Enzyme design. Structure first.
Site, PDB file in Angstrom:
ATOM      1  CE  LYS A  76      -0.930  -0.949   4.829  1.00 28.93           C
ATOM      2  NZ  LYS A  76      -0.699  -2.424   4.655  1.00 28.93           N
ATOM      3  CG  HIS A 118       1.754  -0.262  12.239  1.00 27.29           C
ATOM      4  ND1 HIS A 118       2.444   0.878  12.579  1.00 27.29           N
ATOM      5  CD2 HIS A 118       1.996  -0.468  10.924  1.00 27.29           C
ATOM      6  CE1 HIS A 118       3.055   1.357  11.510  1.00 27.29           C
ATOM      7  NE2 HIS A 118       2.788   0.565  10.491  1.00 27.29           N
ATOM      8  CD  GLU A 159       2.080  -5.969   9.132  1.00 23.17           C
ATOM      9  OE1 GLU A 159       1.718  -4.790   9.396  1.00 23.17           O
ATOM     10  OE2 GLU A 159       1.411  -6.968   9.467  1.00 23.17           O
TER      11      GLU A 159
END
Ligand code: PLP
Ligand code: PLP
Lengths: 419, 418
Positions: free
Chosen positions: A79, A207, A284
């Site tokens: 993304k 995250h 990530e």
């Protein structure tokens, strides 16, 4: 010479008529290619905005990741910048991929990447897209809610779920915890609920927020993830996947550098997730891989003088295009002169505006610049992350072309990784 | 039988570019929306979608002609550049306000002559100015001396329209910080254009998108007259008045279209009487399209936060259609698609877009019955500054637009077309 045309041939094959990848000669940089493209159109009006993207910079980021975080497998956050050349480069390099939706899964699978190198790290997925994942062998997905479990029980009963937990992102540039991440209390219930539904939970993700500014939040998150691992063991799960998310900087133009962050992460991993635990640690990263690789060149297309003497410059990319990052990513952009300024010459208070109809389309409210003229170029470095990925064509303005470059040594390094 | 005639016409009208569905016997655009939801009630194929009523657009045109009989509308393509909208208005006989080469190409691809186009971007990339010159588009807007120099080089025979500043202090979207010459500057621009042998044919202004105070039009019109008088003094034969946009696109507003037109018309008659030789045009965007589009989104995910409050995630968001919340200062209003039970209980709820971003929140707080994954919510008045500025962040695709049009609407369009 013969060597150069050999590398170019292979880079042409790599491009596959989808992107242009230009061989960088010894002693020439991505910056030189940018200057060359500008010089080539100097006596022309063909002065559309464009990027130069250094695929060699992406490879350097990978090497650096391997060294700084040796126990952590990177899954690139598609993304952040879904340009095919970037994903293809990282696919050849051997990274995993964090995919947010069906189209990102499709992109990654089209480049030959196997399903075990994909995490579907969207905690709140449309059922039809969950089914797509199931039908295409993508087994690992995140979740943080009881409803998500009910959906998975129906649409992907054999999935391997990764429970996403809350973090302290209060000091992060982009906060995510208001929207995603189960509290530890909720995590316990989710584990018990998954067990009832016969769904396999295999790990925990978090995250800390994009643009992390307090590295200790990684320690708190890793500690919390251990608590959920322990709770998973009590309910009957064998937990083995730790996913530490993103939040890393993508350039050196920051207060908190990558290595400062990894320096606090590594001891926390060793304490709570020692290698003899059997844990597989992944992350990530998005911004980290791509930010510095892209430099944007825009042309000054219009000009006004406002009476000490101040200037308004209009350029051919704006807030609806690449500079959407100013709004969505809280970016602080720094205009750079393509032509080096005279040591002696006057600077003026100046504003920089995008090409659209909108008064909101302003890129820089106030800066000091030499007097510039229509046809002059301005540069914006570190423009790879959350830029082209979120651009629109409002007013009909098309996205700047991206011209990729790669050196011989970068190409060779990529081949090294690919085996 | 009548269904077969009109749908044949509409099939050909859409061609392989868009789908235009015939609205039968007292079926509305709302009914078609409900119908499409009903069709997928048993499946998981529940992507967000639009129903766009081309008949609503045609009604806006008829309404414009009646309310502002002296003013030729030039549709602001940027507001919503959907081909079906431009093709509909092109058949109607509107002009078009084009912002860039791509918009000019769109309009010309539909057979519209360049005299029905104004290139109303005051600060244009030279190569795009050349594009307009090469394709016969003569009328362009400007507000700076550098723009005159660019036109002298790249489009010397252009007919230029001087854009002036307005008091948009109270408009939702302010534009005068970026565009519009002051009176003092306007005088200098006219003098400079005369000396460069560039023809200045009129004046334009924009009171700000989402006008809140109709008197702004009156002052802008009187300012335009002041600049016309400057033009006559330096030797121009000015004839074009362009009153821009800023009109509302639905009835769900404090300041309605007819209240604005009710103050515009006397100002036009006072400052630009028909005997002056003036041609009056406008650049409406929002007015034509806002109410024509209704968005249906699906609740794809759900959380309970403890009284109990709910978080609903839907399959369009701030990076997509709801970019309007950030760029257009839109105040969106979630609507139930099914009538609630008369006694049943409402909870404090938030509504979130499908992406990774915590910033992707559509409604911070509203009261809703308890909803479930698979339920739809509706957002009306979603035609303006929505699809036109959507991105594919996270890989989410734009909702498909289903066009509809009644028989009477088709006939109206024919009545306009000749
Ligand atoms: C779930 C998830 N993973 C990875 C990322 C990438 O984060 P970053 O670009 O800060 O590394 C994000 C982006 O917000 C995210 O939401
Ligand atoms: C020059 C110009 N004309 C027309 C419009 C369309 O405005 P609206 O949608 O408010 O009618 C705009 C929008 O900003 C504009 O800038």
């Amino acid at each position: 010479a013969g060597e150069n045309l050999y590398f170019q041939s292979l880079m042409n094959n790599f491009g596959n008529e989808e992107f242009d990848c230009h061989f960088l000669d010894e002693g020439f940089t991505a910056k030189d290619i940018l200057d060359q493209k500008i010089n080539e159109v100097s006596s022309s009006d063909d002065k559309d905005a464009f990027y130069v993207a250094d695929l060699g910079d992406i490879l350097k980021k990978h090497l650096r990741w391997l060294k700084a975080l040796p126990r952590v497998t990177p899954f690139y956050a598609v993304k952040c910048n879904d340009s095919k050349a970037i994903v293809k480069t990282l696919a050849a390099t051997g990274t995993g991929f964090d995919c947010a939706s069906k189209t990102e899964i499709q992109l990654v699978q089209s480049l030959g990447v196997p399903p075990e190198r994909i995490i579907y790290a969207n905690p709140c997925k449309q059922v039809s897209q969950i089914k797509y994942a199931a039908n295409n062998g993508v087994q690992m997905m995140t979740f943080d809610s009881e409803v998500e479990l009910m959906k998975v029980a129906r649409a992907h009963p054999k999935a391997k779920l990764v429970l996403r937990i809350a973090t302290d992102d209060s000091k992060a540039v982009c906060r995510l915890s208001v929207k995603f991440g189960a509290t530890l209390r909720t995590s316990r219930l989710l584990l018990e609920r998954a067990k009832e539904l016969n769904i396999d939970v295999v790990g925990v993700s978090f995250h800390v927020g994009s643009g992390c500014t307090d590295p200790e939040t990684f320690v708190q998150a890793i500690s919390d993830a251990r608590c959920v691992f322990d709770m998973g063991a009590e309910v009957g799960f064998s937990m083995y996947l730790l996913d530490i998310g993103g939040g890393f900087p993508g350039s050196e133009d920051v207060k908190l550098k990558f290595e400062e962050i990894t320096g606090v992460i590594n001891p926390a991993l060793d304490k709570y997730f020692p290698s003899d635990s059997g844990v597989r640690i992944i992350a990530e990263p998005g911004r980290y891989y791509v930010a510095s690789a892209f430099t944007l060149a825009v042309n000054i297309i219009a000009k006004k003088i406002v009476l000490e003497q101040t200037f308004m410059y209009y350029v051919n990319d704006g807030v609806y295009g690449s500079f959407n990052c100013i709004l969505y990513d809280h970016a602080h952009v720094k205009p750079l002169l393509q032509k080096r300024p005279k040591p002696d010459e006057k600077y003026y208070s100046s504003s920089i505006w995008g090409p659209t109809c909108d008064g909101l389309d302003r890129i820089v409210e106030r800066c000091d610049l030499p007097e510039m003229h229509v046809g002059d170029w301005m540069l914006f470095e570190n423009m790879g992350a959350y830029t082209v990925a979120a651009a629109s064509t409002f007013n009909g303005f098309q996205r700047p072309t991206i011209y990729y470059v790669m050196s011989g040594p970068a190409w060779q390094l990529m081949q090294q990784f690919q085996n």
